[PDB]
Curated annotation (Swiss-Prot), chain B:
The gene is HINT1. The lineage of its organism: Eukaryota, Metazoa, Chordata, Craniata, Vertebrata. The keyword Lipoprotein does not apply. It is found in: Cytoplasm; Nucleus. Changing residue 26 to P: In NMAN; negligible protein expression due to post-translational degradation; loss of homodimerization; significant decrease in adenosine 5'-monophosphoramidase activity; reduced SUMO-specific isopeptidase activity. This is Adenosine 5'-monophosphoramidase HINT1. Changing residue 86 to D: Loss of dimerization. Strongly reduced adenosine 5'-monophosphoramidase activity. A 110-fold increased affinity for 3-indolepropionic acyl-adenylate and a 100-fold increased affinity for tryptamine adenosine phosphoramidate monoester. One of its GO terms (cellular component) is nucleus. Its main location: cytoplasm.
Amino acid sequence: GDTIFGKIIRKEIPAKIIFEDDRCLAFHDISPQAPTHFLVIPKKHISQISVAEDDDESLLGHLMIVGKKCAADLGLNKGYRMVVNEGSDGGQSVYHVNLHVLGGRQMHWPPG
Amino acid sequence: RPGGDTIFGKIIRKEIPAKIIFEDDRCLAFHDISPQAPTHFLVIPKKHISQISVAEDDDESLLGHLMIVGKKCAADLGLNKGYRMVVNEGSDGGQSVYHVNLHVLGGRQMHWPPG
Ligand SMILES: CCNP(=O)(O)OC[C@H]1O[C@@H](n2cnc3c(=O)nc(N)[nH]c32)[C@H](O)[C@@H]1O
Ligand SMILES: [Cl-]
């Protein structure tokens, strides 16, 4: 089923977009948990990482490379944390694969 | 040496023991020595990359492979209620071993924010 991230990709509702290409979108999280907190999502609707296919490998890696480049562009030179949540225990809030990138503060351990 | 001389390079070359879950030509999955959840393991590339901020464009497939292997291992380990994947970059990220590593944590409710 469609999600709010689908609406964002289709530009039906606003988001603060950081980067776009033909296969992904990066935008600031509406509920930021760090001074910088954005998401990188594929345009392909993969509901969750547990159902990602083998053929999706380089696309998932693309999310991480885009995330790393956006983090550098946003000035996160002291570092950052990347997170993917799966399901209930993972605290996944939207069933559209999304890579969190958080920084601008010390991230702590355990990671939730 | 292939893998570098971080603790993870030693583990890749079987010079230091680890509890291995999965191994192929591109990566290694093994349990974390200081688990932060009832199940907590790591997926690392065999190719040494110090941190995600210096990964090359051509590392895309490899990085994605870490996640695919991570999700497959999580299923094999019975993490049916879900899990969290984490990559830490640098000081603010809390990185402690400068060899790229993906954490997979499950077997309990993970909380928000993720640290
Ligand atoms: C926040 C932790 N820093 P990181 O660089 O993101 O992750 C490094 C992880 O490697 C783990 N570590 C560090 N040393 C070892 C080890 O010798 N054997 C195993 N199996 N794991 C080991 C450590 O507990 C930590 O969670
Ligand atoms: Cl989520």
